[PDB]
Ligand binder design. Structure first.
Ligand SMILES: COC(=O)c1cccc(NS(C)(=O)=O)c1
Length: 284
């Protein structure tokens, strides 16, 4: 079926939970043996969220190459994304090592450091220009260059230096600051505006390594971001945009990381975002 009318048909019939459970039943199951090794317990935020072995990002290190991060490679859309958990106190150095080694331009953050009165990820970037951060375990230095605070999101320019080689690179930090503590946003308008700002920066383009996207577990809000982006790109590429099937795209992405889209409310929000986004692209 088309999307917008499949949408109204699920709303009127109140069957979002049944649609979402079908997705969960059909989703791929692949091994994640490296994630479950005892030496990696303090590298995982949640015991039930792990990268598959076949698609995990490897650190360029001979001691321990493990990070909780996955490469989502979308062949028809010609887009790639790295989805990862919010960094932990003992993985902030690994996080920036990955950004460096994978040649990423942008980092997309969809959570606040504290939500619901608890810590959802480490404070992994500097908050003042004159107070830079050094990660001694991976030999990197990170400096805040500039910060632009808007009503729904903040953009930061950061400098990452590889202290071994003295090479430097500019990294863009895109921080969506207004996702509610419970549920999903009422309108997708600010989330779509944010997606378009990431796109306009070059961070999603083939001349760079894959964008790094995270929330707390790296599967819920993060899944919504890459699902909406890929569906809108396919609607631009194809002769028949109504052929884009958001459930099929989601199942394809779940071949590369488990659990993408965590609730039926997130599934409904993803439909809403793609539907509204397709009108703004045009032609309008
Ligand atoms: C404050 O940092 C920024 O907003 C910033 C800095 C440097 C470059 C960009 N790129 S763009 C595509 O959003 O125009 C943004």
């Amino acid at each position: 079926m088309e999307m917008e009318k499949e949408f109204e048909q699920i709303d009127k019939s109140g069957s979002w939970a049944a649609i979402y459970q079908d997705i969960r039943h059909e989703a791929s199951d692949f091994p994640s043996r490296v994630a479950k090794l005892p030496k990696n317990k303090n590298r995982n935020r949640y015991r039930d969220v792990s990268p598959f072995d076949h698609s995990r990002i490897k650190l360029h290190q001979e001691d321990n190459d493990y990070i909780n991060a996955s490469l989502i490679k979308m062949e028809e859309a010609q887009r790639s994304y790295i989805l990862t958990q919010g960094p932990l106190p003992n993985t902030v150095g690994h996080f920036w090592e990955m950004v460096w080694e994978q040649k990423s331009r942008g980092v997309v953050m969809l959570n606040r450091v504290m939500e619901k009165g608890s810590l959802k990820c480490a404070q992994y970037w500097p908050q003042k220009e004159e107070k830079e951060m050094i990660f001694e375990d991976t030999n990197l230095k990170l400096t805040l260059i500039s910060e632009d605070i808007k009503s729904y999101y903040t953009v930061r320019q950061l400098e990452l230096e590889n202290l071994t080689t003295q090479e430097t690179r500019e990294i863009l930090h895109f921080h969506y600051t207004t996702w509610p503590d419970f549920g999903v946003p009422e309108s997708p308008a600010s989330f779509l505006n944010f997606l378009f700002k990431v796109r306009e920066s070059g961070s999603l383009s083939p001349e760079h390594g894959p964008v790094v996207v995270h929330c707390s577990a790296g599967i819920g809000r993060s899944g919504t971001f890459c699902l909406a982006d890929t569906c809108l790109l396919l609607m631009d590429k194809r002769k028949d945009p109504s052929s884009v099937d958001i459930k099929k795209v989601l199942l394809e992405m779940r071949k590369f990381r488990m659990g993408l889209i965590q609730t039926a409310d997130q599934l409904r929000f993803s439909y809403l975002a793609v539907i509204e986004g397709a009108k703004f692209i045009m032609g309008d």
